[PDB]
Design a protein around this nucleic acid. Sequence first.
RNA 1: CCUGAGUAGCUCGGAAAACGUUAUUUUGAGUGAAUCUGCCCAGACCAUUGGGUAAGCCUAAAUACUAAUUAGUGACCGAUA
RNA 2: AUGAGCAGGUUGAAGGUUGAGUAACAUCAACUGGAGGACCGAACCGACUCUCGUUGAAACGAUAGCGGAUGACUUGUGAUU
RNA 3: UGGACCUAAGCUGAGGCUGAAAAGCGUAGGCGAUGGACAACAGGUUAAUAUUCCUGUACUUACAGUUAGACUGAUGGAGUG
RNA 4: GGACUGUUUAACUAAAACACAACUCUAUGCCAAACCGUAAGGUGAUGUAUAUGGGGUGACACCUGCCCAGUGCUGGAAGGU
RNA 5: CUACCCUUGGUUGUGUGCUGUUCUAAUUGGUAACUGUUAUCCAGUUUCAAGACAGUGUUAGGUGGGCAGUUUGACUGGGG
RNA 6: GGUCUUGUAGCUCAGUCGGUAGAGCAACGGUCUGAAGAACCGUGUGUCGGCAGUUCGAUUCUGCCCGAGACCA
Lengths: 285, 63, 145
Amino acid sequence: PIKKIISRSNSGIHHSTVIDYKKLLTTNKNKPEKSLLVTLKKHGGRNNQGKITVRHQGGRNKRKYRIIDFKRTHYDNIEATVKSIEYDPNRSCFVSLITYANGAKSYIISPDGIKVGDKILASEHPIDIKPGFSMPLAFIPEGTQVHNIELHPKGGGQIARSAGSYARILGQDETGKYVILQLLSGETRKFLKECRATVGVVSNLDHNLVVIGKAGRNRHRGIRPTVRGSAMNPNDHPHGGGEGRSPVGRDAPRTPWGKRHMGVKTRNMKKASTNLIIRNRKGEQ
Amino acid sequence: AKKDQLTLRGPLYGNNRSHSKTITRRKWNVNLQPCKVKTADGKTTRILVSTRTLRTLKKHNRL
Amino acid sequence: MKVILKQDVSNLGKRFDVVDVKDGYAIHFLFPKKLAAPLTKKSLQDRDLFLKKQQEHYEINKALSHKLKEVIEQTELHFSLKEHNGRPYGSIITKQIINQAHTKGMALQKFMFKDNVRLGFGDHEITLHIFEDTTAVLKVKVTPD
RNA sequence: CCUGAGUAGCUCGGAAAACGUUAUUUUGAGUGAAUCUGCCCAGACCAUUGGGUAAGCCUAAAUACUAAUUAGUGACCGAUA
RNA sequence: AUGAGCAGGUUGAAGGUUGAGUAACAUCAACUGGAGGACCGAACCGACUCUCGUUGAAACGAUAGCGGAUGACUUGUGAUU
RNA sequence: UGGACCUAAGCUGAGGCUGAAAAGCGUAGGCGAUGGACAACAGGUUAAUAUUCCUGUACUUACAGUUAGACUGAUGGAGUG
RNA sequence: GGACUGUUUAACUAAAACACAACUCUAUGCCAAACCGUAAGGUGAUGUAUAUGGGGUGACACCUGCCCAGUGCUGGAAGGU
RNA sequence: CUACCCUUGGUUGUGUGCUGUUCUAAUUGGUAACUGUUAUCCAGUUUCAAGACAGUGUUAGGUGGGCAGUUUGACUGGGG
RNA sequence: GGUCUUGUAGCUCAGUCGGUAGAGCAACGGUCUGAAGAACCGUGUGUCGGCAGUUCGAUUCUGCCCGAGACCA
C-alpha cells in the first residue's frame, strides 16, 4: 500500500508517493522502546582512520539499529512470540521483535506470510516450513523460495535477505553435498546442505515503486546528490570544465581513478566460501 | 612488522635498474611463513618464520 | 628436520629405523612419532645410540600401547547432546576431546583424535584408532535428551 | 683429531668495492663443503708455486672538540657593523 | 554528536469521517485531523540583482527588493578527514 | 552548571595485532560538554556581591556514636531515567 | 534549457552550470564492488542485490531508433611463445 | 639368417613435457566456540569452505597521467 | 622473446601405388515463356604466387622473403 504526497506548493509539483508505514510498521509515533536499544556512532561516510571512504553519502539523522539476530539459534525448543513489526533505519526490510517464552527477546526478519503474533520456532530441527521459521535445507524439497541464508559456519545471515529475495532449490550436487540455490539477481551458489533457511520472500512486496521527489528524502536515504561528469573541474576529472562541454570518452567509462568497473569482471575470489559458487551473471564461479 | 615476528631483520633496500638504468630503490622483505610450531609447558603457540632461517632451524631440529 | 621414523611406519619408505625422506609439514614432520635427533654432528656417536633408543622405544611403545588401550577402554570419553525427542541440534569438534585428553593428566596433542563436523540426534558412537600393531578403540558415550 | 657449518663456492637484482656490480663478499629467495697443497684467492679459475686459515673477537695510542672548568690571544668589530 | 528561532496570518491535504441514497449498486456532501525541500511576512541568514566605494565606516560592508523563514531553512559548542 | 559523577561526537591508553627508525589500529579501563544527574528561593548589604554573605524559607549523600526500628540487599534482572 | 523550491566562483560570474527527481547502464554471492592506511581493522556496514558505488542525461510523457571494423566486456575452440 | 639405415600404428611403461584427483597432517580467512577476560584491535587450541591448487618471501611481468623527474628543436624582415 | 603460415580466373578454391585444372556468379552465345523474372547449359581466363631440393612424371612431395590463425613475459 502507498499514499500520495500533495505538496500544495505554489511553485512546483510532486507526484511523490510513500508507503503508508501504518499497516506494515508498528508504532508510527516513534518513541525509542528501551528493551533492545543500541546507540549508533557514525563518521558521515568516513572511516576508523578518519578519512572518507564512501563519497556522496552523508547528512543523515541519528538511527537506533535494532539488535537483529540473523542466526536464530540463541534459544531453541521454545517458539518465539512476535511482539511487533518494527522499523529498521538501516535496512529496507522490516525487523520483528520476537520474544521466546523462556524470558528473552530478540529481533529477526519476518518475511511475507507471517505477521505479529505468530509462534515461530528456532532450531536445526525438522520444524514446520513457514515464514519466520528457520530449518536446514535438507528438509525442503526442490522448487521453494529461501532467504536470509549464510555461506560460512556461524557467519551470520548475510546473503539474499532483502525484500523480494528468494533462493530456488534445484536439488543437490552429484557428491550429495552443497545443495544448489538460485539466488536473487540471477546468480547461483552451491549452498551447504546443513545451513538454516528462513523460507519466504521478505514482507512488503509493494516496496518496488516510489518517487523520492525532494532531496531531503534522497539525502537522508544515503544517496546524496550525484554530480554529472559534464561540467566538472578539469582537474581531478579528465572531462570537466572548458567552453563547449566535451562528450564523455574513455570507452567503458572508468571510475575516476586507474581502475575499471564498466562491464569488467570485478569479482573477489579469495574468501572462505568461494568454492561454493556456480554462476555470477557472466561466467562460472 | 613486515619483518616476521621470529626475525626482526631489516629488509634489504637496494636498487632496481631497468632499461633506463635508473636509481630507483627496491625493498627486499624477509620471508614470511606462518607455519605451526610446537612449544613446551602447555601452550603450542605459532609464529611467522623466514625460509632462510627455516633452513637453519629445521637442520637444527626445530620441527 | 626429522631423521628417525621411530617405532612407526608412515605407509612409505620411512620404516622403523633411522631413515626418512622429506615430506614437508605433514604427518611426517608435525607428528612427534618421528623424533628429531641432533643433526649438527650425527656420524657415529648419536647414530647407533639413537638406533638403540629407537629399539627400546619400540618395546616400551608396545608396553605403553597396551597400557593406554586398557586406560581408554576403562576411563573413556563421555559427552552430552541436546535433544527434544528426535530433534537434531548437534555440533561436534575435536577440541573437547583434546581437552579431555589433557585433563587425563597427559599433554596429548591434536593428533590422537580428529574428526569432521557432524550433525546428528539420539544415541550414536564414534571410535578413533590410536596404534598400528596393538591398536586401541575409543568409546565416546553420548547422552541424548 | 681439532682450527668456527645453512658456514666458505655459486646463484634469481641490487650495493660496499676506482668499478653505476665484471674478479672478492653479498642476501630478500634456492642452495653448500674441508679439518687443512683440504678450503678460500691468485680481478673467470688453477698446475709448479704463491697469499692466508676465515665464518667470535678483546684492545687506551694515532679518529672529534670543549658537554661543566682553566688559562691567554686579536693588520677583531665599532651601534646600518 | 549536544542543545537552539520560525511571531502572526495562512493551503488545511492525505488517512478516515456520518447519514442520505440504491434491489444490490453507483453517487452526494461535509468535518476530526494537520501534510509539506508548503505560502505572505518578523527573529535569523544569503550578496541574486542596481547604486556607493572604486586609496569607504567596510582587507566586504550600507541601502532597495527578492529568497529561505516550518526545511535542500537559519545555527552555537565539542570533535572527525 | 563543567568537573567530584555519567557518557554522545572523540581521545588517551596496560596490553595486544600491526609497522625500518617513528608509531597506526585499538581492548581492559578513564578522560571529553554543547547535554544528563545529585542537593538555595525572594528581601537586605558596600566605593566594587549575590540563589553564594545574612534574614526568612531549606535540600542532598546523610556522615561517627547512639536509641529506636526493622529482611536490607548488589556482583545479578527489570522499569523511569 | 532547467522539473520546482534550491546550491557553488563569502569579496564584479548563481545560472541554460550544478542539484532531488525519472530514465536508467555497470560492478558485486560478502572477507562484497567502491574506499581510508602499507598493516591490522574499519566506512561501505554487518548494507546483501528491492543495498551501495560508479557512468550518462534529466521532472511529467514517447522511446532512445542504425550499425562491432577494432578497443572495454561476455561468450568460442585449437597456438606461437 | 647375422647387423645398420629409416619408416608409420600401439599394450606395460617410461628420456620429454600434459594434467587430474582421496585426506589435512600445512596455508588463506572483518568463520566461529572455549579461555585469557566479563579484553571491539586481540593472542593459544580448534574445527570449518577449499586445499598444497593458491597465497606468502624473491624474481619476473603486464593493464594502468592516478602522479612525478621532465621533453614539448631551430632559422623564419614578429612567430605557428 | 616471437620460430605457427597460405597466393593458382575479375572473387573463391584442391592436387591418387607421387602420373591429372576446375565450375559457380558478373557475364560471350544459345534454351524456357502471347511476355518473363527465377532458372538451364555450353565461350573464356592460370610460368598451378615466384625462387631452389626430392623421386617413376614437383607448380602437386618439400624450404624460403611479403598478411594471416587458437592457453603469451
